[PDB]
Design an enzyme around this catalytic site. Structure first.
Site, PDB file in Angstrom:
ATOM      1  N   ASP A  44      31.846   5.661   3.068  1.00  0.00           N
ATOM      2  CA  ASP A  44      32.840   4.463   3.446  1.00  0.00           C
ATOM      3  C   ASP A  44      32.661   3.760   4.534  1.00  0.00           C
ATOM      4  O   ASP A  44      33.618   3.268   5.425  1.00  0.00           O
ATOM      5  CB  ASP A  44      34.153   5.089   3.372  1.00  0.00           C
ATOM      6  CG  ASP A  44      34.641   5.823   1.901  1.00  0.00           C
ATOM      7  OD1 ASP A  44      34.953   5.130   0.926  1.00  0.00           O
ATOM      8  OD2 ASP A  44      34.801   7.132   2.081  1.00  0.00           O
ATOM      9  N   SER A  45      31.439   3.212   4.885  1.00  0.00           N
ATOM     10  CA  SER A  45      31.159   2.135   5.704  1.00  0.00           C
ATOM     11  C   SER A  45      31.039   0.759   4.969  1.00  0.00           C
ATOM     12  O   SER A  45      31.087   0.837   3.619  1.00  0.00           O
ATOM     13  CB  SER A  45      30.111   2.071   6.488  1.00  0.00           C
ATOM     14  OG  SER A  45      30.202   3.445   7.414  1.00  0.00           O
TER      15      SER A  45
END
Ligand SMILES: [Mg+2]
Ligand SMILES: [Zn+2]
Lengths: 175, 209, 848, 171, 50
Positions: free
Chosen positions: E22-23
């Site tokens: 989740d970057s």
RNA sequence: AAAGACCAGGC
DNA sequence: GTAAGCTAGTATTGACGATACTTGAG
DNA sequence: CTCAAGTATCGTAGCCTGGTCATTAC
């Protein structure tokens, strides 16, 4: 859990901080179905948005078209006789079978013989602005009862009335 | 049999299973007892002792296999609640009989906290059981394991290796199933080898404590 | 010495054991050095370049924010190559202390390699870590020697590696496997990243195209020199990948086999060097291709959706209105909806992007995609949920109210829609109840793992492998175990050595699947945590709960070798056991006047015949019980002095209402000792003493068995509570439950099931039937049988949540439980019991 | 039944105040347990037949008939002929007045003040007591449901006026 | 004022392994032209007696 | 100083 | 001195383990 | 003349880090 701080991070946080509702409980962590949506929330409290910490489900948010009623200051019991309600006599010897009991804020004030005409006439007189707009009329077939509420704290919402809905065609569609 | 029920007395059947359980525990303990005094039917049991059997016509059991002076008896009981004066009188006649080295008191419904201290003073080593614990043989169950007790010299040779003093060992209590099924005293040390797909080739040693 | 908190981000192009540190952090933290020979010039260069922050000669701390003589303390700032150790704040992160090598940058975050997310159980969505900075030199040695990544490479909870190829690396390998060949330019571009040299092409010349490598020659570019090993699906010889078999169902396991080959024979850091060369190669391979997903990937066809809806309205909805009205033992619902979900997954894995972005063999991650593409399934039920049954009845009535367009067209607890096409408002409310229950169970329910870890560490803290090898407690110096592993001795070293704190490792390996199960809060992960609590939290005092009275009874095999004869023995023993009473057949109680007052208990004729009862039976089974109750406990029961009983098939007294007119069966009773001058006290005694005790008389079955139901078992667990019988799998069992009024001390339920099974006992498998709770097996079979059963149950429950936990920790837990003599729990009742019953200092250095 | 005043609470309970007694009806008014048949004849009813007309059993239901005859012959086991003139009213005089902190009133003004405010005559209060007992007996037989406090038709919502009134009364 | 944010053009793609766990990856030139640029005002208060 | 009370982020 | 006017006087969301008491009867 | 027991209460029930406020005068 009564008075909170007003947040001003954006205008939406201030908007939703003013539209909350709370069920306060003793030991937080052992409640019943208080933390869950009930089907009587439909149209009046949001069943999708709630906190997720300890206050999960205990703090609710008002729906968009939701209204909280206020107390009616005019007397309403003397205008119930005009729709077919009769007195509660004083002899304790006469039986009252077949008649439905009427209850105004929980107080027994009379009886009515036909209940599917009393309710439909009260509702018609409310739709023409000679009965107050925040008056709740409930007909109860199993308990043989007619309950009327005029007190503060009830959750209301607007709805279209289908049988009066043909009165738009003949009107003018100005806003 | 697929839907058969036995329309007979149950109490004779209960004494049958309990008596063969007592015989089984003496034979697996090691004493010499008669073969087929274990292995006999329910029906011929009902022929020899009836359907409502009397308890003092029991099997007065036998003596040791290799030793001679180590002999034992069994004592069965009546149904109702018991008082220890009966046990002291029957113990007086037991020690009057010839000689024993102990007996098994199979009780019926209750033992008394006044009884265990008032049998503690007697001149041999006796056991107390329960009639309803003695129905299923627990060493015939599938989950049961071997408990081979090792000699005093092998106890010394195991204490040789790890330099330990017998109260630093893992324990097994004396009010346990297999401990009273073999009649073990405090301080003996037993071993058990585990079969089972997470504990295969794994042995343990416990001191009765 | 110092500590630091910061937000983490990722970086795939630096080494696995490297950590990037922001400059604002780095220029304010110091390291201390003692200046002496071999470092006068090197530290003088630093103090000349104004990189040492502070100083102390002797004790007076003079600042530098001076030439060097040997013997004082320089405090310089953090630079490249130092060692820190990292820890996410250990809420569940019990073993995550890692030692890493420092490089400095200009940004605000802490950068780590993406392979270190699973050893830390962190992600990049806002997580912060704490970095600690060791100052003392012996502390630097301990940190560098115990907690480095190459030291900690093989896990101590399982036998596996802490480093696994994850999300983008595995996807890069999959797309590198579905096309096999590469042209010259991209192959040499990839060969720029390899540590070895690029080989000659596998294909030198076709007439169509030029030369072409295969992807095995690209994957071999990360090996060390002169490697030759072997595993399941591969052969590596002469540092060349000779063989690698087809699969996507095997690929991660084959990579794990290659890495364990390298780390069984290759070096001091060669598996880390393999990862450090492999990962940027895979990123640079995937980057000129891209990978995405479109709406076409999420749109099931009209045909397959019609098949899904037809299978629901055919199979699932008429069954769910039957077996949900029964009780909890019918989870046939879950198997049938799992069959329909299998059909949906077989439909949806035709899209090429969706099969590469999940793990196909995983089931918790394949249900989540079926909920998006096809139906959601069951959302409301009244079994082991945190809401009550009144909510479920309210929702069923609301379902009748809102779907006024053809109500009962399906069920109220089944959602038929998907997330991709959108839910109804009713389906949204039904789904929102289930989501709210999962959220509440995951947040409030994190206290039983929190208690369990405290009570596990309180008892398992001081259990050490000693210098002679015996696993021992140290506060009491008692043997818990003679050997930790089964092949550990002084010729062969192992995974564990002397001085290892094996008790703490067992406690953490037990606490991890509990926290994982509650943080998931699926039905499977709820049942596993139930099965784990029923072993780990036993009570030495008898509490006579519901499980304490349960007994599983097995059966024999093959009456005369005829078909359909084992179920007949099952109901034979069920009809012998099951309790039905006189009030289960009574309808009215009619007092008559004809001494004077005569009671008429009236019956039902049909349920006597449907259970094969006659009336002389009921007279016998009332008379024996009433004479026992006037014999047992003789006070205030002298109402049955000369009370009378009588029986008749037909009485037809027929008081004013609900007549049956003929053969309404009647148990008349009377009294004769109550010579009363008044009728009003006679009515009191005959309607308030006798009629209560005559209703609860049992007529068919045994008075002590509360219930005896039949379960088919056969849960493809293959005899869940049997160990070695046969290769049979389909036995039917009875789950007897005794009434609470009979079990007084522990072990009684077996005693009253066997004694009440006595006239039918030639049919029951005596050598196989057992109780249900583990302390009752301890009372029946002994301590060793309870030990083995506790291992066998704890292994199944822990293997359902997290796979592959080593047997050594489980065997140590079950040994520490049963070391006192009887099996105890990890609660206060077990802890005070044993408490009442009852590395450091391992070596010493000196000069020579 | 609840109201504003804490002296307005009215409870009818169906229980056993004790072998194997039949379940009887009890009134908890002004912290004083009174049989409900005594309160029926205190409010002015004349006959047991018109009292069971005021309850309106809807027929059948032998548990209801058993409970009402047990409550009658338990009312007769506490006062000696309460049906005769002002015997039951004198009984509720001596039963109210003996409590902790008795109210500063005779019983007739106690009934006109603290018994069912909003009704006029004692006839109507007897009718309301019969309706209350009918509601309890209907819930007993399973024809009526118990109230659950999660259904929002049993809830009111208090905002600034309701809270500020309560806070201002204290100070 | 019910909505507080920007309309960003989003692609769904891998970017050299920099957007895992989740970057997200952003554009430098879109940020320099003023996307998601923020102003922040903090107040520091003090009091005395008069 | 010390505790209450609130909110947020995790587990 | 605050005890939290007197305040009710049981008369409204928690719910289990854990420890401590007034029976009958060998 | 004591166990068990049927209540009679006690007391903890998620837990930890952050940031914040507002803290009876008599
Ligand atoms: Mg995170
Ligand atoms: Zn009859």
């Amino acid at each position: 859990g009564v008075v909170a701080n007003l947040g001003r991070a954006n205008p939406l946080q201030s908007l939703i901080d003013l539209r909350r509702t709370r069920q306060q409980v003793l030991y937080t962590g052992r409640v019943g179905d208080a933390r869950y949506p009930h089907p009587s929330h439909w149209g009046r409290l949001c069943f999708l948005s709630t906190p997720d910490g300890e206050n999960c489900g205990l703090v609710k948010n008002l729906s968009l078209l939701g209204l909280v009623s206020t107390q009616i200051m005019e007397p309403v019991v003397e205008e119930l006789f005009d729709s077919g309600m009769e007195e509660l006599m004083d002899d304790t010897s006469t039986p009252l079978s077949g008649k439905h009991k009427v209850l105004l804020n929980g107080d027994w004030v009379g009886v009515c013989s036909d209940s599917d005409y009393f309710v439909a006439d009260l509702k018609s007189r409310r739709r023409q602005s000679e009965l107050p707009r925040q008056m709740e009329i409930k007909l109860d077939k199993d308990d043989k009862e007619v309950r009327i509420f005029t007190d503060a704290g009830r959750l209301l919402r607007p709805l279209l009335v289908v049988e009066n809905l043909h009165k738009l065609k003949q009107s003018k569609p100005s806003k | 049999l697929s839907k058969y029920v036995d329309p007979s007395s149950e109490e004779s059947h209960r004494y049958y299973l309990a008596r063969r359980n007592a015989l089984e525990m003496l034979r697996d303990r090691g004493y010499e007892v008669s073969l087929e005094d274990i292995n006999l039917s329910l029906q011929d049991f009902r022929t020899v002792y009836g359907e409502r059997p009397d308890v003092d016509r029991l099997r007065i059991s036998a003596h040791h296999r290799s030793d001679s002076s180590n002999k034992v008896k069994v004592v069965f009981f009546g149904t109702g609640k018991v008082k220890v004066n009966t046990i002291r009188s029957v113990a007086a006649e037991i020690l009057s009989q010839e000689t024993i080295t102990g007996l098994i008191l199979v009780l019926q419904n209750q033992v008394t906290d006044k009884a265990l201290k008032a049998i503690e003073l007697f001149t041999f080593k006796v056991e107390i059981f329960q009639i309803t614990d003695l129905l299923v043989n627990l060493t015939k169950h599938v989950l049961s394991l071997r408990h081979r007790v090792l000699t005093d010299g092998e106890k010394k040779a195991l204490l040789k290796q790890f330099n330990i003093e017998e109260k630093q060992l893992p324990r097994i209590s004396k009010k346990d199933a297999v401990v009273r099924y073999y009649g073990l005293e405090k301080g003996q040390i037993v071993k058990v080898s585990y079969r089972g797909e997470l504990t295969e080739s794994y042995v343990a040693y416990r001191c009765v404590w | 010495g110092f500590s630091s908190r910061s937000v983490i981000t990722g970086d795939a192009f630096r080494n696995v054991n490297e950590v990037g540190i922001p400059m604002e952090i780095a220029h304010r933290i110091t390291f201390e050095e003692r200046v002496s020979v071999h470092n006068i010039g090197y530290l003088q260069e630093l103090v000349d370049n104004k990189m040492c922050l502070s100083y102390t000669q002797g004790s007076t701390t003079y600042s530098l924010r001076t030439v060097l003589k040997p013997g004082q303390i320089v405090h310089r700032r953090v630079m490249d190559g130092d060692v820190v150790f990292i820890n996410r704040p250990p809420t569940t992160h019990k073993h995550s202390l890692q030692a890493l090598r420092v490089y400095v940058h200009e940004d605000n975050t802490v950068k780590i390699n993406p392979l270190m997310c699973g050893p830390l159980s962190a992600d990049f969505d806002g997580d912060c870590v704490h970095l600690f900075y060791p100052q003392s030199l012996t502390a630097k040695a301990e940190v560098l020697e115990l907690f480095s990544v190459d030291k900690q490479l093989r896990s101590s909870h399982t036998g596996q590696l802490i480093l696994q190829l994850g999300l983008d690396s595995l996807l890069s390998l999959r797309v590198m496997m579905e096309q096999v060949f590469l042209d010259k330019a991209s192959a040499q571009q990839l060969a720029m990243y390899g540590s070895r040299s690029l080989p000659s092409p596998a294909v030198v010349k076709s007439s169509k195209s030029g030369p072409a490598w295969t992807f095995f020659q690209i994957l071999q570019l990360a090996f060390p020199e002169r490697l030759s090993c072997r595993g399941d699906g591969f052969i590596v010889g002469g540092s060349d990948l000779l063989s690698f078999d087809f699969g996507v169902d095997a690929l991660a396991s084959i990579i794990n086999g290659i890495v364990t080959g390298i780390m069984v024979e290759k070096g001091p850091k060669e598996a880390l060097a393999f990862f450090d060369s492999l990962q940027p190669l895979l990123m640079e391979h995937l980057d000129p291709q891209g990978f995405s997903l479109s709406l076409e990937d999420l749109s099931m066809s009209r045909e397959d959706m019609g098949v899904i809806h037809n299978l629901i309205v055919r199979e699932i909805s008429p069954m769910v209105s039957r077996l949900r009205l029964s009780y909890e033992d019918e989870l046939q619902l879950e198997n049938s909806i799992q069959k329909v979900k299998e059909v949906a997954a077989n439909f949806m894995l035709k899209s090429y992007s969706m099969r590469n972005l999940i793990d196909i063999k995983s089931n918790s991650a394949i249900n989540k995609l079926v909920q998006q593409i096809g139906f959601l399934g069951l959302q409301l039920s009244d079994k082991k949920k945190l809401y009550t049954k009144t909510l479920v009845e309210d929702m069923a009535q609301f379902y009748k109210k809102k779907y006024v367009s053809t109500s009962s067209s399906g069920d109220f607890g089944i959602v038929k829609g998907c997330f991709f096409h959108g839910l109804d408002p009713y389906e949204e409310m039904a789904h929102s109840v289930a989501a709210r229950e999962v959220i509440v169970r995951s947040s409030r329910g994190l206290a039983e793992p929190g208690t369990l870890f405290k009570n596990l560490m309180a008892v398992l803290r001081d259990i050490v492998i000693t210098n002679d090898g015996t696993v021992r407690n140290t506060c009491s110096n008692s043997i818990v175990q003679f050997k930790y592993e089964l092949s550990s001795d002084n010729e062969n070293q192992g995974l564990f050595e002397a001085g290892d704190p094996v008790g703490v490792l067992a406690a953490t390996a037990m606490s991890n699947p509990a926290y994982k199960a509650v943080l998931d809060s699926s039905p499977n992960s709820n049942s596993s945590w139930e099965l784990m609590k029923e072993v780990l939290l036993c009570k030495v005092n008898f509490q006579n709960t519901t499980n304490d009275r349960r007994v599983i009874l097995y059966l024999n095999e093959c009456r005369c070798g005829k078909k359909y004869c084992q179920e007949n023995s099952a109901y034979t023993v069920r009809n012998k056991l099951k309790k039905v009473s006189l009030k289960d057949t009574a309808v009215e109680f009619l007092v008559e006047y004809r001494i004077c007052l005569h009671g008429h208990i009236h019956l039902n004729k049909t349920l006597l015949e449907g259970w094969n009862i006659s009336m002389q039976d009921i007279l016998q089974r009332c008379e024996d019980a009433i004479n026992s109750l006037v014999q047992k406990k003789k006070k205030k029961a002298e109402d049955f002095k000369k009370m009378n009983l009588s029986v008749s098939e037909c009485c037809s007294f027929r008081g004013p209402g609900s007549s049956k007119d003929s053969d309404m069966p009647c148990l008349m009773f009377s009294s004769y000792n109550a010579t009363d001058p008044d009728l009003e006290r006679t009515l009191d005694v005959l309607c308030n003493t006798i009629y209560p005790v005559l209703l609860e008389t049992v007529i068919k079955g045994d008075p002590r068995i509360a219930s005896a139901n039949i379960i088919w078992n056969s849960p493809e667990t293959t005899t869940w509570i049997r160990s070695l019988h046969a290769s049979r799998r389909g036995e039917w069992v009875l789950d007897v439950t005794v009434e609470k009024s009979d079990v007084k001390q522990s072990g009684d339920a077996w005693r009253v099931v066997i004694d009440s099974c006595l006239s039918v006992l030639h049919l029951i498998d005596t050598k196989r039937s057992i109780p249900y709770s583990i302390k009752q097996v301890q009372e029946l079979l002994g301590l060793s049988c309870a030990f083995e059963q506790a291992v066998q149950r704890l292994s199944a429950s822990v293997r359902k949540v997290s796979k592959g936990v080593l047997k050594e920790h489980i065997i140590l837990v079950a040994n520490n439980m049963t070391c006192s003599g009887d099996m105890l729990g990890f609660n206060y009742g077990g802890y005070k019991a044993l408490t009442r019953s009852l590395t450091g200092s391992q070596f010493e250095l000196l000069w020579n | 039944y609840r109201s504003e005043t804490k002296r307005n609470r009215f409870i009818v309970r169906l229980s056993e105040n004790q072998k194997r007694k039949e379940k009887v009806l009890t009134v908890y008014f002004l912290s004083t347990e009174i049989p409900v048949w005594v309160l029926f004849f205190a409010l002015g009813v004349a006959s047991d037949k018109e009292a069971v007309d005021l309850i309106a059993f809807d027929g059948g239901d032998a548990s209801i008939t058993n409970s009402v005859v047990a409550s009658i012959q338990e009312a007769d086991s506490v006062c000696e002929d309460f049906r005769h003139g002002r015997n039951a009213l004198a009984y509720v005089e001596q039963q109210i007045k003996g409590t902790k902190f008795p109210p500063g009133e005779s019983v007739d003004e106690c009934l006109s003040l603290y018994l069912f405010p909003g009704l006029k005559s004692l006839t109507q209060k007897a009718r309301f007591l019969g309706y209350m007992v009918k509601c309890l007996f209907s819930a007993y037989a399973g024809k009526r449901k118990c109230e659950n406090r999660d259904n929002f038709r049993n809830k009111r919502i208090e905002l600034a006026g309701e809270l500020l009134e309560r806070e201002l009364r204290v100070h | 004022v019910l909505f507080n944010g920007q309309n960003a053009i989003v692609a769904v793609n891998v970017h050299l392994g920099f957007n895992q766990e989740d970057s997200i990856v952003m554009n430098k030139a879109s940020l320099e032209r003023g996307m998601f640029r923020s102003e922040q005002i903090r107040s520091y208060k003090a009091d005395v007696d008069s």
